[PDB]
Symmetry: D3
Subunit: 135 residues, 6 copies
């Protein structure tokens, strides 16, 4: 079994999809190991987005994650990592994401993607330590 | 943002899926700009199906759209055109349409496809003028 | 069988519940006889609210129905009138409306009631003539 | 607007209803002000259940809340208190709770009630201070 | 724990509600102990409806249960009997049944009630022996 | 129109998905021709899994199908065979099955696949004779 970090971003909250997203995870058979509505410091935001740190969309990327609170969580279970990304869909909700996924069903813009899921074991271990340093 | 024409055909109505379809559109983040249950004249039907005007399935194609009332609508929003076709699925509901789409979830026959969505900007502009000449 | 007028007010639209409401109606076994997204003139609004014409909440009552478009419809079927009001719930969504109803599930304020349904045969016949004078 | 404390108890979690419950809250128009999966100390449990402190069911009442983690939350909005209790249903899910409520739809036992909601302004203010002393 | 007999009548099947009904039962926490789509002999129908044997609606009552196949089942769990009747709603779907129940959400006529649930321990034991004499 | 055999395996039952699965079938427009919760003899299990009779996973394959009761059914309609497999998804729920399918939405393991659907006309005719020799 694996552990992956999941974020429900400020747009997912504005659109009232916290429970919808969590439900899909639960229904897949995965288990919520940690869960917390929290605010994001300027520091955390950048450390999170270091992969795309130096790039054209960095600015508004941080301003976004910091505009309102977010819901962070540790999702655990068999193939947690791949499964979550499976539920989430591709980055582009119209041309990439399949219908039935979170982004595929609710999203229209690459930017406002509603959700985040660790893209690899390497990332997951790094992001969990980052958002849930205690646990 | 774009505007696209959407039809909920007589079979979509017989099967009580008006609200189900509209909901999926709404949930995607798209907005219903126009909406009307209406009947179809012989003329409108053919002007609509002019693309496939001369073909083997034209007859019953018109007889169908004219058998009962239909629900016409203008759907507006970011990438309205592609998104709607994304929600609708491919023409063949079993071999083409993905599960999660409208046709993929409810349809079994290429003919009885429940729904219509403009396939391009060129078409949308033409079909909207056709169904909602005022608006 | 009966005919009743149903309104999905501007708040029902802002909250993306057109399809949700229509679906509940469909699922009850009732049939959408007429349906149209339309704007409301100052005149229509008052003629509609004549029952509560002279009262303390009249002003903002009209300003509301006229702030954005609404979805009007004629719902037909066995006991259409009572059934629709059954689905809609009592006027106060928290103290009157039962869970499971439209207002009971989605509403919090007596004012923002999302929906309207004719309260009697007398009213229905009057309101249908008013909103769908042709049909 | 009001603030009320909501608990999703260990049975609500075992039965995979976190998102289902949160969704119902969201859909009612209420907003999640705080949210956290957390464990319960022996002390917190009793301070929470002081109202029924001296009684026949106290023992297993505490042992339960402490058997696994729970999801605590602050729910905010118009009539937050009454509305939440409205969504939750009466204590007895079969004879009291109406269909459509959380308990009414999912529960069978008075003990395993899935959810908790502050029963009054007095309680809410006390329980929020208790579970979210910071916020 | 108790055992109760549940019938999904021919109208429940025509309206594609087998899974919807079963789901509601499952979700309540009850368990399907037996389940079978079967036809009804003239004899079984009357033995079932002996309570209302001599009455004005007996004829079409039997003709109905015998018009198409039905889905019979034994539902088991805590307060199975009351809970099932709770999910089913009162006999009259508009004036008696609450929204959120099966009849309350889908039915319009006292006759076409979609579902049946044993009304008492005495009945349950009698009807189970009748429909599932082996089990 | 075609006939296909569908199994809801013991894990589909443990996870309370009987009605969910049946519903998806119904909603696709397919019809339940036969349906029965039943136990599986050692013989039936192997005759069913003869295709993969001689293989590394045979043992626990039979032990599984025989651990608890299962729900067998004959599903009938246009392209019943392909459609059902379409609803079910690929064998591997994470890497193969698309979101929106049964396995895609609920499953995490190739072994615990919740459902079975005949993979061909040849198989269907053979498996129906096997599970429903009378009908």
């Amino acid at each position: 079994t694996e552990r992956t970090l999941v974020l429900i971003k400020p747009d997912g909250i504005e659109r009232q999809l916290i429970g919808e997203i969590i439900s899909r995870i639960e229904r897949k058979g995965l288990t919520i190991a940690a869960l917390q509505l929290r605010t994001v410091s300027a520091e955390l935001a950048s450390q999170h987005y270091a992969e795309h740190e130096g790039k054209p969309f960095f600015g508004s990327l941080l301003e976004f994650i910091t505009s309102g609170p977010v819901v962070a969580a540790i999702v655990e279970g068999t193939r947690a990592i791949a499964a979550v990304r499976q539920l989430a869909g591709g980055t582009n909700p119209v041309q990439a994401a399949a219908p039935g996924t979170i982004r595929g069903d609710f999203a229209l813009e690459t930017q406002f993607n509603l959700v985040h899921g660790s893209d690899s074991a390497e990332s997951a271990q790094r992001e969990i330590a980052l958002w849930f340093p205690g646990a």
